[PDB]
Amino acid sequence: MELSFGARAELPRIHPVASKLLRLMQKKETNLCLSADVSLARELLQLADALGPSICMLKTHVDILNDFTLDVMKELITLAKCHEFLIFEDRKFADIGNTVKKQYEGGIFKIASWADLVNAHVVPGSGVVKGLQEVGLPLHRGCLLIAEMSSTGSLATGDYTRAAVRMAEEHSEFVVGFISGSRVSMKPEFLHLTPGVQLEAGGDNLGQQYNSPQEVIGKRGSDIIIVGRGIISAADRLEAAEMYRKAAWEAYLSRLGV
């Protein structure tokens, strides 16, 4: 009952955003999401171009860009289209519906205009999702709910995690999956994306914890690895990206039996 990415893309209950993603993952043999945590647009675009072929998704923090403009986003979309990857803004919407609606649609970033995917914390209750949903957009858009976090002392456990899953299942018209450390939903239509990934054991000095692709994808049953520093801080970024891609891909293959 474990299905390939390509098969999952065709599930009756699949969201169009999820389908698109799943299809390209299968085509490109990648379940790697690059976390492009950089300070300059030039670097963001360089990464997108060089590593585009190796990734299913590019995760942005547009607020960390010193020189964000929508023109930058236009260029990013072009690369996304070229290389075939989704854009995920790691916005972490985390307030009342009325506020997040505005934060998604409007303001300086105009996130909804370019981000295939965003994420939200579940702490405010389901209003956080409802608010995001109320943004009118004749484009295919999805949301990921933060069900678990990668950091030491995370409170996104137990009943909290269950709450996230329930909220997702109840808003499946928009919510396409999770940020989690493992498989949290038994429903194959939902994507699992996992940050806190490096080839080596460890962490950082500010509460990040790392697990390997084999652990996260293979043992813990997640779908996609999110990797920042493991790539962007590497001596050879393309080489690193390819290692991560191959690691995650093989780990995934291991679940498909035969």
Binding site listing for UMP = 35, 37, 59-61, 95, 99, 150, 208-210, 228-229
Measured between alpha carbons, how far is 71 from 164 in angstroms, rounded to an integer?
Answer: 35
> For ligand CNU, which residue of 131, 195, 213, 221 counts as binding (CB under 6 A)?
195
What are 243's two structure tokens?
Answer: 């290692």
Asked if 95 is an active-site residue, the reply is yes
The active-site residue, picked from 49, 95, 219, 246, is 95
Q: Is 179 in the site for ligand CNU (CB under 6 A)?
A: yes
By beta-carbon proximity to a copy of itself, the closer residue of 16 and 207 is: 207
CA distances 56 to 39, 109, 127, 209, 235, Å, are: 22, 23, 30, 23, 22
Q: Is 174 in the site for a copy of itself (CB under 8 A)?
A: no
By beta-carbon proximity to a copy of itself, the closer residue of 78 and 98 is: 98
CA distances 30 to 167, 169, 182, Å, are: 28, 26, 18
Q: Is 96 in the site for a copy of itself (CB under 8 A)?
A: yes
HSE, side-chain direction, 13 A CA sphere, residue 60: 28
Name the amino acid, one letter, at 72.
V
What, of ligand CNU, a copy of itself, none, does residue 64 touch, CB below 5 to 8 Å by kind?
a copy of itself
Answer for the pair 154, 146: CB distance below 8 angstroms, yes or no: no
Q: Is 112 in the site for ligand CNU (CB under 6 A)?
A: no
Q: Is 109 in the site for a copy of itself (CB under 8 A)?
A: yes
> For a copy of itself, which residue of 3, 11, 50, 64 counts as binding (CB under 8 A)?
64
What, of ligand CNU, a copy of itself, none, does residue 227 touch, CB below 5 to 8 Å by kind?
ligand CNU
What, of ligand CNU, a copy of itself, none, does residue 118 touch, CB below 5 to 8 Å by kind?
none
Asked if 90 is an active-site residue, the reply is yes
- Residues 199-204: contacts with CB under 8 Å, at least 24 apart: 199/230, 199/243, 199/244, 199/247, 203/152, 204/229
Buried b (16+ CB within 10 A) or exposed e, 115-150: bbbbbbbbebeeebbbbbbebeeeeebbbbbbbbbb
Answer for the pair 195, 209: CB distance below 8 angstroms, yes or no: no
CB of 66 to ligand CNU, least distance (A): 16
Q: Which residues are catalytic?
A: 90, 92, 95
Q: Which residues bind ligand CNU (CB under 6 A)?
A: 35, 37, 61, 90, 92, 95-96, 99, 119, 146, 149-150, 179, 195-196, 208, 226-230
